[PDB]
Design a protein around this motif. Sequence first.
Motif, PDB file in Angstrom:
ATOM      1  N   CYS A  34       0.848  -1.226   0.000  1.00 28.20           N
ATOM      2  CA  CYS A  34       0.000   0.000   0.000  1.00 28.20           C
ATOM      3  C   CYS A  34       0.871   1.258   0.000  1.00 28.20           C
ATOM      4  N   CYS A  35       2.146   1.123   0.238  1.00 28.28           N
ATOM      5  CA  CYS A  35       3.025   2.327   0.227  1.00 28.28           C
ATOM      6  C   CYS A  35       2.738   3.122  -1.045  1.00 28.28           C
ATOM      7  N   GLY A  36       2.246   2.460  -2.057  1.00 27.15           N
ATOM      8  CA  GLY A  36       1.932   3.155  -3.335  1.00 27.15           C
ATOM      9  C   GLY A  36       1.754   2.115  -4.442  1.00 27.15           C
ATOM     10  N   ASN A  37       0.948   1.113  -4.208  1.00 29.03           N
ATOM     11  CA  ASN A  37       0.743   0.069  -5.250  1.00 29.03           C
ATOM     12  C   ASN A  37      -0.652  -0.551  -5.111  1.00 29.03           C
ATOM     13  N   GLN A  38      -0.781  -1.575  -4.311  1.00 33.34           N
ATOM     14  CA  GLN A  38      -2.108  -2.236  -4.152  1.00 33.34           C
ATOM     15  C   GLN A  38      -2.750  -1.843  -2.818  1.00 33.34           C
ATOM     16  N   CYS A  39      -4.040  -1.640  -2.821  1.00 29.22           N
ATOM     17  CA  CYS A  39      -4.758  -1.272  -1.565  1.00 29.22           C
ATOM     18  C   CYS A  39      -6.235  -1.645  -1.722  1.00 29.22           C
ATOM     19  N   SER A  40      -6.996  -1.593  -0.662  1.00 28.79           N
ATOM     20  CA  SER A  40      -8.443  -1.942  -0.768  1.00 28.79           C
ATOM     21  C   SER A  40      -9.012  -2.216   0.625  1.00 28.79           C
ATOM     22  N   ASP A  41     -10.288  -2.002   0.806  1.00 23.03           N
ATOM     23  CA  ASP A  41     -10.903  -2.255   2.133  1.00 23.03           C
ATOM     24  C   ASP A  41     -10.555  -3.674   2.581  1.00 23.03           C
ATOM     25  N   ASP A  42     -10.639  -4.624   1.689  1.00 23.58           N
ATOM     26  CA  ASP A  42     -10.303  -6.025   2.062  1.00 23.58           C
ATOM     27  C   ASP A  42      -8.856  -6.072   2.546  1.00 23.58           C
ATOM     28  N   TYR A  43      -7.979  -5.381   1.872  1.00 31.67           N
ATOM     29  CA  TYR A  43      -6.553  -5.371   2.293  1.00 31.67           C
ATOM     30  C   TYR A  43      -6.459  -4.761   3.693  1.00 31.67           C
ATOM     31  N   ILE A  44      -7.304  -3.818   3.981  1.00 34.30           N
ATOM     32  CA  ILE A  44      -7.279  -3.170   5.320  1.00 34.30           C
ATOM     33  C   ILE A  44      -7.590  -4.221   6.393  1.00 34.30           C
ATOM     34  N   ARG A  45      -8.553  -5.064   6.144  1.00 37.10           N
ATOM     35  CA  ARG A  45      -8.909  -6.105   7.146  1.00 37.10           C
ATOM     36  C   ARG A  45      -7.639  -6.810   7.629  1.00 37.10           C
ATOM     37  N   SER A  46      -6.803  -7.237   6.723  1.00 37.14           N
ATOM     38  CA  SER A  46      -5.558  -7.943   7.136  1.00 37.14           C
ATOM     39  C   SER A  46      -4.542  -6.942   7.692  1.00 37.14           C
ATOM     40  N   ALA A  47      -4.830  -5.673   7.610  1.00 36.35           N
ATOM     41  CA  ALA A  47      -3.879  -4.662   8.153  1.00 36.35           C
ATOM     42  C   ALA A  47      -4.428  -4.164   9.485  1.00 36.35           C
ATOM     43  N   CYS A  48      -5.713  -4.261   9.648  1.00 36.91           N
ATOM     44  CA  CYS A  48      -6.359  -3.832  10.916  1.00 36.91           C
ATOM     45  C   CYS A  48      -6.750  -5.073  11.718  1.00 36.91           C
ATOM     46  N   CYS A  49      -7.244  -6.084  11.061  1.00 36.94           N
ATOM     47  CA  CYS A  49      -7.647  -7.314  11.796  1.00 36.94           C
ATOM     48  C   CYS A  49      -7.485  -8.537  10.888  1.00 36.94           C
ATOM     49  N   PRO A  50      -6.250  -8.906  10.659  1.00 37.94           N
ATOM     50  CA  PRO A  50      -5.904 -10.068   9.822  1.00 37.94           C
ATOM     51  C   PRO A  50      -6.098 -11.368  10.606  1.00 37.94           C
TER      52      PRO A  50
END
Length: 50
Positions: A34-50
């Motif tokens: 996500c620094c500047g490539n792929q991101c998404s609410d789903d990706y957030i789940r594993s970043a906030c609650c993986p």
Amino acid sequence: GETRACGRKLISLVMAVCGDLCNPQEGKDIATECCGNQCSDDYIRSACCP
């Protein structure tokens, strides 16, 4: 001026999506895409609650 913001940006953008509710556990990786490539609410789940 301002420095880089990616690992911080991962917890920053989610701090508004999770609101310190889930958890930015080990953010030294998910922020690697996500620094500047792929991101998404789903990706957030594993970043906030993986």
